[PDB]
Design a protein around this ligand. Structure first.
Ligand SMILES: [Fe+3]
Length: 267
């Protein structure tokens, strides 16, 4: 599979000028979505933070005082409506939701138990959530006039960090793939050929179209289908709108509100 270099070629988006740099990057990002099926930006300094956060997650995965299994999803308080946050034991991974970060009470306890990792995770979540909301504004700008705002929800969005680990697409609106520890993540292009973005140990983030946005755009943007081929840590932000909010669809340039909610779409 051909390597795809992105360092030094993707638009640069600085941590303290995110809104303005994403405005400047807008045309480059539109052209990536048109030309590739997924988007990319280089965020100087993001790699340092992600690598530290992942290394602290790896260390937490082996800790046996207030261990991570103590915060497995089935013993963590969950929202009445919404996805499932907490730790998923064994290949082993954690879902750090926006709700968890605001302690919505006791859901925040895994971050109190592992505050070094938890502080990095909250920091990465906030950066990733600002970036991905602006990616969503870019995609919205490519859709017909009258397209509603994506309304990605802070509390419904989650940062997944995977320890240890086929072609697939996410069910969410958008995802932001943060630089993983190792190479192997691969994306299919519009022509059906596979490429391997060079992202391990870089400052490059990728933005994935999810199947909610495929539905909302009525097939205009296919999901950013990808797979993972190895020879290990990875993190990704999965962004969702409010579960109770009403689905919509731009069909033939015309906005349509459906009876089903975004929560129904997931089921
Ligand atoms: Fe994935």
């Amino acid at each position: 599979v051909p390597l795809m270099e992105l360092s030094g070629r993707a638009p640069v988006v600085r941590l303290h000028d995110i809104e303005a740099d994403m405005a400047a990057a807008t045309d480059a990002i539109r052209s990536q979505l048109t030309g590739w099926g997924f988007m990319a930006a280089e965020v100087p300094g993001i790699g340092e933070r992600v690598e530290a956060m992942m290394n602290e997650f790896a260390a937490a995965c082996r800790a046996t005082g207030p261990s991570l299994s103590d915060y497995a999803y089935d013993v963590v308080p969950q929202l009445a409506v919404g996805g499932t946050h907490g730790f998923f034991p064994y290949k082993e991974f954690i879902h750090v939701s926006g709700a968890m970060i605001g302690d919505q009470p006791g859901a925040g306890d895994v971050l109190r138990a592992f505050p070094a990792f938890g502080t990095r995770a909250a920091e990465v979540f906030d950066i990733a959530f600002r970036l991905i909301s602006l990616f969503g504004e870019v995609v919205r700008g490519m859709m017909p006039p009258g397209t509603p705002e994506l309304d990605l929800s802070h509390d419904a969005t989650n940062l997944r960090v995977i320890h240890y680990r086929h072609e697939h697409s996410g069910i969410q609106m958008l995802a932001l793939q943060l630089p993983p520890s190792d190479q192997g993540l691969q994306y299919v292009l519009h022509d059906g050929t596979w490429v391997e973005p060079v992202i391990a140990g870089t400052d490059v983030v990728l933005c994935n179209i999810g199947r909610m946005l495929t539905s909302a755009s009525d097939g205009r943007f296919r999901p950013s289908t990808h797979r993972v081929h190895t020879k290990r840590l990875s993190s990704v932000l999965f962004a969702y709108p409010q579960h109770k909010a009403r689905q919509w669809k731009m069909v033939d340039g015309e906005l349509m509100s459906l009876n089903a909610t975004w929560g129904d779409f997931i089921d």
